[PDB]
Amino acid sequence: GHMATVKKLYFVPAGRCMLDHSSVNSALTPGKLLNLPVWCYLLETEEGPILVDTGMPESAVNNEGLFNGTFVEGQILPKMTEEDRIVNILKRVGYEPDDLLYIISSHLHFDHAGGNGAFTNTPIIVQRTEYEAALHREEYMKECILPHLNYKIIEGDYEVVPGVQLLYTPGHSPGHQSLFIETEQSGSVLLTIDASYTKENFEDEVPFAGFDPELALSSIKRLKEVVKKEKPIIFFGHDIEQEKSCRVFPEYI
């Protein structure tokens, strides 16, 4: 259209989040927090720019105690400043919300959809099973399921534009989706998002936080079949070790 690859894939830091280490390895005894990366991804494509995930909600800004008084008190502590609000991140990079062709929500956890309300015109691509879940499960914040946004509800695998494929990967959340991207510079890239927080969750199948761990494992299996075929480079969702070698904005892949 004419391109089969994305021009640039940017990894864009969007604040951080403390979680207990047992969230990355369900076998670990709770009591040590890990300061984990929160990411959004920007895709420059022939048809326009696409943003994958939108960071944390404004209620998390300078509010590590956001989850005090809830069922996750002391287990999740967002590390978010004013600068990490998605509109401010976008403006620094060179975009306004209405510039974006699409938003892709991997899932509607607070660390992935907290910014969604900023995008009131752009279509927001989300799995039906995720949208449905967000309407009632208690792990979902109001900020992540605002009623009148321009949702583009999808079911299962989906091609967003040429070069940008969504892979249905439920388990971590009921409608979680991962990304398989073909880039001009790097070729095949698999962004697991939270279908594996870390390399060991994926390769070693170490269990991690999720709504349905059995499902999460089947999704990992499915991803391994794609990997066997495509031999992509693979990036995990909340991996402090891999983060050490990620190329990040203004670098791209």
Determine the interface stretch with Zn ion among 66-74, 95-103, 108-116, 121-129 (rule: CB under 5 A): 108-116
Q: Nearest Cα to 90, choosing from 111, 119, 112? A: 119
Q: Considering the complex, state which of residue 15 and residue 163 has its C-beta at the smaller distance from Zn ion.
A: 15
The only residue of 20, 53, 84, 111 in contact with Zn ion, by rule CB under 5 A: 111
From CA 242, how far away is CA 59, in angstroms rounded? 28
Least distance to Zn ion, CB of residue 244, Å: 19
Count interface residues toward Zn ion (CB under 5 A): 3
Q: In the 8-state DSSP scheme, what is residue 6?
A: B
Q: Residue 53: CB partners within 8 Å, gap ≥ 6?
A: 14, 39, 40, 41, 104, 105, 106, 112, 113, 115, 193
At closest approach, how far in Å is the CB of 4 from Zn ion? 29
Decide: is 130 part of the binding site for Zn ion (CB under 5 A): no
Determine whether 63 is exposed, middle or buried from the number of CB atoms within 10 Å of its CB (0-12, 13-18, 19+). middle
Cα–Cα dist 137/50, whole Å: 28
On whether 21 is known to bind a ligand per the annotation, the reply is no
Site for Zn ion in 166-205 (CB under 5 A): 194
**107 among the known binding-site residues?**
yes
Minimum CB–partner distance for residue 112 and Zn ion (Å): 6
- The annotation places the binding site for Zn(2+) at 107, 109, 111-112, 172, 194, 238
User: Which residues here bind Zn ion, judged by CB under 5 A?
Assistant: 109, 111, 194
